[PDB]
Amino acid sequence: MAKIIVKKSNPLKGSVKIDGAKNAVLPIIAATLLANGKSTLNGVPNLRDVHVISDLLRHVGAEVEYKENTLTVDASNIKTCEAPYELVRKMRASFLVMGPLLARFNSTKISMPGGSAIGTRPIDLHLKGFKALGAKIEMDHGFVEAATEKLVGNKLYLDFPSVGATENIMMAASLAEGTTIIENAAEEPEIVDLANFLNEMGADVKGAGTNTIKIKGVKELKGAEHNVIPDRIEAATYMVAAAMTKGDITVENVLMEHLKPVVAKLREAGCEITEMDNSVRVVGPKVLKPIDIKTLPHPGFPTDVQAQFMAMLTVANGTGVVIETVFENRFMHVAEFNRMGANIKIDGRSAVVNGVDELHGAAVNATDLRAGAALILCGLIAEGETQIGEIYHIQRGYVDIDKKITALGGQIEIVE
Amino acid sequence: MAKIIVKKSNPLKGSVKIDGAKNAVLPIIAATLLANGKSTLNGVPNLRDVHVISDLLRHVGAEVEYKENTLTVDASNIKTCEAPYELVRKMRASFLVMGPLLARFNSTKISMPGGSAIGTRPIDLHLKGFKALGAKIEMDHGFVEAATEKLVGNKLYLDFPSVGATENIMMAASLAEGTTIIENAAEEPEIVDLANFLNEMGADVKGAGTNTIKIKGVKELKGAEHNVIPDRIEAATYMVAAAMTKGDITVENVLMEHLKPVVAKLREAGCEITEMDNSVRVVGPKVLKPIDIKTLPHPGFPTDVQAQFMAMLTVANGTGVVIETVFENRFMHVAEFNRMGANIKIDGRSAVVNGVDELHGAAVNATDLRAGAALILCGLIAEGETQIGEIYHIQRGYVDIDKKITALGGQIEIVE
Amino acid sequence: MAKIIVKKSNPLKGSVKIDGAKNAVLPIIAATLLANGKSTLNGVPNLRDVHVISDLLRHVGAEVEYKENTLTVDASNIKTCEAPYELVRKMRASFLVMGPLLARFNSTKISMPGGSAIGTRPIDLHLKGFKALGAKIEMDHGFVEAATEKLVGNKLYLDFPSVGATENIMMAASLAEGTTIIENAAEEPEIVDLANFLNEMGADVKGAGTNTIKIKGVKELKGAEHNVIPDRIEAATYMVAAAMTKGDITVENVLMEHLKPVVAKLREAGCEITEMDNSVRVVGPKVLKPIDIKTLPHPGFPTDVQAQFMAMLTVANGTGVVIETVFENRFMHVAEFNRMGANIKIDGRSAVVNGVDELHGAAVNATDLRAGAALILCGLIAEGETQIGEIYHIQRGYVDIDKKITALGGQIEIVE
Amino acid sequence: MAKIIVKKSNPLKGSVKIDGAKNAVLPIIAATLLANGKSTLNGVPNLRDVHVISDLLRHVGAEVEYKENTLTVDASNIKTCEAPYELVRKMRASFLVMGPLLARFNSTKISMPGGSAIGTRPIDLHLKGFKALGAKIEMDHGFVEAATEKLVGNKLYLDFPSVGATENIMMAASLAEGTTIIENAAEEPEIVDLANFLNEMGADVKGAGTNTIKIKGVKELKGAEHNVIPDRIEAATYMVAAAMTKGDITVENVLMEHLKPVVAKLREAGCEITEMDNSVRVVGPKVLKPIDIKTLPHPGFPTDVQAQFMAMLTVANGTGVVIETVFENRFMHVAEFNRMGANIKIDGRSAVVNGVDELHGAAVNATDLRAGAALILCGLIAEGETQIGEIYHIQRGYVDIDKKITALGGQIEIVE
Ligand SMILES: CC(=O)N[C@H]1[C@@H](OP(=O)(O)OP(=O)(O)OC[C@H]2O[C@@H](n3ccc(=O)[nH]c3=O)[C@H](O)[C@@H]2O)O[C@H](CO)[C@@H](O)[C@@H]1O
Ligand SMILES: CC(=O)N[C@H]1[C@@H](OP(=O)(O)OP(=O)(O)OC[C@H]2O[C@@H](n3ccc(=O)[nH]c3=O)[C@H](O)[C@@H]2O)O[C@H](CO)[C@@H](O)[C@@H]1O
Numbered sequence A, B, C, D: 001m002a003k004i005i006v007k008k009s010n011p012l013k014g015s016v017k018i019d020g021a022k023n024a025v026l027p028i029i030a031a032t033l034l035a036n037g038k039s040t041l042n043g044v045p046n047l048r049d050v051h052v053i054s055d056l057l058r059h060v061g062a063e064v065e066y067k068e069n070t071l072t073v074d075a076s077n078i079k080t081c082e083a084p085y086e087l088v089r090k091m092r093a094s095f096l097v098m099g100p101l102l103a104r105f106n107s108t109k110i111s112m113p114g115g116s117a118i119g120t121r122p123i124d125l126h127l128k129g130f131k132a133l134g135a136k137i138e139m140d141h142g143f144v145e146a147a148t149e150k151l152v153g154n155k156l157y158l159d160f161p162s163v164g165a166t167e168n169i170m171m172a173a174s175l176a177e178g179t180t181i182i183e184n185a186a187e188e189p190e191i192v193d194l195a196n197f198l199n200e201m202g203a204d205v206k207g208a209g210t211n212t213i214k215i216k217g218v219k220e221l222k223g224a225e226h227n228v229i230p231d232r233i234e235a236a237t238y239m240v241a242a243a244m245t246k247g248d249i250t251v252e253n254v255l256m257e258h259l260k261p262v263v264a265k266l267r268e269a270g271c272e273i274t275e276m277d278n279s280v281r282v283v284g285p286k287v288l289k290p291i292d293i294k295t296l297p298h299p300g301f302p303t304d305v306q307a308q309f310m311a312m313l314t315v316a317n318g319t320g321v322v323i324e325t326v327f328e329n330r331f332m333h334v335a336e337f338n339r340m341g342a343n344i345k346i347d348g349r350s351a352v353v354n355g356v357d358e359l360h361g362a363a364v365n366a367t368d369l370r371a372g373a374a375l376i377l378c379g380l381i382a383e384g385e386t387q388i389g390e391i392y393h394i395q396r397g398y399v400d401i402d403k404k405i406t407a408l409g410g411q412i413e414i415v416e
């Protein structure tokens, strides 16, 4: 089956345009279900996960059309409020329709997400918030059912600043009676994008991007036009590629405010970075300095760039420590890095990376979206040729990584 | 030597006035060193740790006077910029003079804190920030020396939102040339209190209480009058006491905004809480509901209330899980809770608390400030009598816990 | 694709015959490569992993024939000493040919195992032992190469009592010049089975089953007949099934000495167990008592029964704690147990299981061999019907689990 | 108060005689309580912990006399079976009288050990074994009471191969009616010493030093003469001192079988070691090679040498990883190593040691017995002078460390 073949490449040089954020667009597409009218989303990345959540909206009866990075949704005449097992199993972000469906029809039944490549990921905090708003919760044979005679705004505390729980609860709160306060909210940039979209539809959401979000419920929302933010994780991926290949890349159509920790840590590794209004230039160092990273809730270092930074560290000039505080099992890629000649030892949530002279091409498998991109970055610097399998992991969340890297001078080909 | 004797007590009832915050006043006292004039701090708690940092200020040549909860400092004529081993060993918050001394004299030499009761606690992030501002760092026989021809504002990223590092770097930045940006700053309420004090002295600090702090350096600061915020951890301690004893306590002179996670989790345990402008009323439930807690950076659940909430959980109606993400070894109290008949099992950063019918009085030792207060709370509900040793841990950070609990109806006595 | 459908079943009752051990037979099949003649293995289970290692032996030029639970190998005329990427990727126990091939031809080149469902699993200790015996190690593009002018016996210490490293090093040592001592050896029963087979072929291996193994090298080994031990993990699986279903099962063709920790913990859970010479009877309790388990090197509780014991605990009368010390990520099944209505929370290497009234059938996926068997056990007690996917995980390591459970009265069917 | 002053020293050279094992002699002294007559223990080290357990025996009514490394105990006329809070608080190994007292009088009441410097250390497995033998357990105000009409031999499984639980249960089993089997027993050398002593008194204990111990109860035991084994941890301490100081030390009156993991890892670090019948010679390398260690049950690497090996690693030529699997919080010394200029970072149970050019003398505090000895080893190689406080930690478990190191050429003095 399909492989990505990467060869030892030239230093990456040139400009790369970043697509719209996968992780902004998925909750914002769920949010269109809140409105009795037609929404228009611009800057939608042409990814399989976008087309899966689109098909879940079609399943509940919304009208969806996609063309040329625009998606329109008419949620005027939703029929059903069930998310079946197949669609949640395909893409767990499907779970983000639970808040809007509960808000629009006072009842929803959603398949409970199972195992995930990067850890055991409960959705207890989503349910905690729905219960706080007056929903009764019950489990039926793998489905979670939430129902109320009416949502009522309430204060609620998140035990962890969950991105998904913050999104799901903000969307349910947008149509509730009265004021909801989310304490210890996720501060991720996608939370601010979703809030901005809710407000464009007529909502009253304040404090997004801060540790406390206040939602004053409205009776009805209306479809609106929205420009999705750029993908800060895709941007980070190309910035690391510049660092690893001693390259010089200008990343275009980005927001520097969303990239702070990645810029800081790349500068600590020895990159020369020039931040501009709509773009950032990264010049890789001749010798990578070893750095430590610790993944944390935004604006701490993002777990979605952990595997890629770990890849950079495999050839750094000394010992780096990677601590993963956000996910339990997000080290499955380590054994694949080790096949390419890395020196990585893990215990608990920490991985000790002892820099080596160079990596050596090998047959490797992508284990998840971000680790697969990290294996491409390894392949760009590994002596010889690297063959990456299980490439659906990569292709679901990166637009045309082969064409983008090819335009920067790299040697990469997808083969079927 | 000295003991605290607690007996099985009546439900606590009445009002308790909360003192000024230990953890606001210690950095704010360090901050007085920045000013060439006289500062006046009101609402200073009469604690030994306040008198130790006072003696460190005297050692470097400030004029200090304490009376009736007011402390004045005249830092006009500081002489020396060394913090000796004895004073840092007595109280590691002594380390907070490093930023002001570096800012005022471009050189400082500070004993590096050693072992702490609650974990291995490096000060690497403090030094990272000082280096970012242009200080050269070197180690001399247990001392860390920082020196520059001049501090220059710079952007810097905290790998962890360290309270102390945020404080130390904000104070050094206040006199630097140009603008400092602290990314992934601590959002704790004491950070906002310190910033407000710096601004009263003439500084330019914005974003305190948010994930990013911008400091625009000034050439000179002037002594100012400051009212310290209330102790949110002392307040929380009395709120838990009300929960555990099925009592009804009004906690006076508090700020509800600073107590959000404790209020939320006590309500989840079944407390009836009434939040007012300057006070909160807590009515304990008849049956405590088991809850989980996870300690996190503010506004997540505070590690300084973890031992006390764990004590409440020892008699809850089921199984609670306590996860400590902020400190490594903050479970030393568990073996003392177990001596009183608790059922607590730990592995890694998690403690599983299986609620028991009641605790039984025993001889126990305080291991640290907050655990010792937790043993007092255990003693209030434990059948018979509890004798707590190593009471200096408690007395250093709580004003008159014996008199406050006695005024609420509890049976407690300090014996020498 | 293929599913296993399990329905709420009757209490399991009757007798089940246990097959030969997967984990004894795989190293013993590798061991046949040491001998210049024909070996005969009896009691070989008819499993896909047996047929994969058989095809690796064919690849290096051994003559292999399988019929009716007997496998014969003639290794007289081995040609090649390379284990290609495809075969190691299919089954990482392929790595166990490295010791015999190095011993027979003084050179071998073996694909380095990559990611595994249950964790990052390095083979550093195997290489440590080969280096101790005088092999030079080098990495070529995902392959590990070991070569020497001659193996020489030496003392070596295992940092962890690795099963695989103990096996690989014992087999390499069997033909080395002089005496090898393995300190901190694996004490697992399969180590004793392998040693017994090596000695039947003419080797000199003493102390297998103890913490120290001494091998006195011989010049040549000869094919021998060997009876493989029973599968203690399959036996344990049926013993747990009896516990969970309040059944009464006699497990036949087992060795009680190999089952000590499972017998002890099932008795602690309330089972009535009768140990006999060749069989054990398990009578499940009416109410399961909650127990804790901690996985450890033999004779501690086996990690290969952790998922199954966790499944039993999901309906126990209280709170059980499962600690996994042997593998890093062996909790991937938890999210699937939770889909069936379990109450399991994980942090680090510990899982807190809060017993529920009953499980509810759901669509679930096997994540690995032992977890998939655990989902079958869940399915036997879950209200309604359970549909298990990704069933190749199960079928590779269990002989006819559908027929065995059907003969005990359970409702189970494999559908294609 | 008292300090140990260590200066940068010459390479240690010469011979050092090792004392009798602290951890053999403490359970063997408890074991004398089993016998209705007079025991004679030779090779008893002149340590405070020996004199504390001696005073506990006096408290229950045994006749005890100590002179010149011989201790005699006449337990003929024991009166009482209570171990009071003061004595267990002074030394938790006091808990080892519980098994003998329960065996001799069918009742005992023992203060439950509280907090320990190196972790939360429950005694649940001791009680599990006593319950298995037919004792009823209950808690009274910090005391654990065990009582039976008669002990009856039974099979029992240790969830962890606890040294103390193995000792306590073996001693209780020695007078029980019938056969006790301890499954997953501690294999530590002190377990074999205790068993040998029990058998000298008339017991029937087989399998000590293996993973299974069988005790056939007898009606009465008689006092006996016993030679205690050498202290393998003291020996290891001097062997590390030779490694760290590039010295050449012959350690006399030792058993090489008890030192296997320490010898192996020191050889891996580059030491030249010559093992003899009663002694071992260690020649330190010119350059220490970095090694990893992982603490495990014997015969894995001992946790009691972890701090000392960590100290050696602080100046090794690269990165070493220390994993502590046996105790939770056994890293309290790291902050003291860091005061001396080490580069150690911890997360969870792992410490990453990045070797430095040299350590620098500083004021440091001993946190526990073995860490304090490790600070002496640091002090021997640290530039300048080191002053160690809280020296009672060291003095309680090492005989005349000042005189022994002085006789090997080191510069060390105890000052009062
Ligand atoms: C579609 C999308 O935007 N996906 C992203 C989103 O995931 P997602 O929204 O799932 O991530 P969360 O922030 O919820 O998860 C963070 C942690 O919280 C835990 N948790 C979460 C929810 C809950 O109810 N209970 C609970 O315990 C999770 O197991 C995890 O350990 O943020 C992650 C963290 O930056 C990214 O890696 C994902 O790619
Ligand atoms: C005087 C004062 O206000 N004390 C409080 C302050 O401590 P303090 O300011 O020491 O606490 P931090 O927020 O710095 O520590 C949090 C974590 O960060 C780590 N860290 C910190 C600094 C650094 O340079 N590197 C590093 O790794 C620490 O080891 C710890 O694990 O906040 C803590 C967390 O709410 C409280 O428990 C303390 O009582």
Ligand SMILES: CC(=O)N[C@H]1[C@@H](OP(=O)(O)OP(=O)(O)OC[C@H]2O[C@@H](n3ccc(=O)[nH]c3=O)[C@H](O)[C@@H]2O)O[C@H](CO)[C@@H](O)[C@@H]1O
Pocket: C023, C024, C026, C093, C119, C120, C121, C122, C123, C124, C125, C126, C127, C160, C161, C162, C163, C164, C165, C190, C302, C303, C304, C326, C327, C328
């Ligand atoms: C074919 C076979 O018999 N498989 C079994 C064998 O696996 P296997 O022989 O792989 O298991 P090991 O005992 O080697 O692994 C135990 C632990 O040691 C670690 N380790 C191992 C080797 C090494 O060189 N370095 C290292 O760090 C592993 O990552 C793991 O965490 O024993 C396991 C433990 O009972 C079982 O679950 C497997 O089903």
Ligand SMILES: CC(=O)N[C@H]1[C@@H](OP(=O)(O)OP(=O)(O)OC[C@H]2O[C@@H](n3ccc(=O)[nH]c3=O)[C@H](O)[C@@H]2O)O[C@H](CO)[C@@H](O)[C@@H]1O
Pocket: D023, D024, D026, D093, D119, D120, D121, D122, D123, D124, D125, D126, D127, D160, D161, D162, D163, D164, D165, D190, D302, D303, D304, D326, D327, D328
């Ligand atoms: C007097 C003596 O000989 N002391 C030694 C003995 O301690 P001790 O006998 O206390 O050590 P154990 O082997 O019992 O402890 C090992 C681990 O098991 C745990 N555990 C132990 C008992 C129990 O009932 N439940 C439980 O969970 C402990 O918390 C610890 O994490 O062996 C230790 C391990 O080599 C050494 O460091 C000690 O110096």
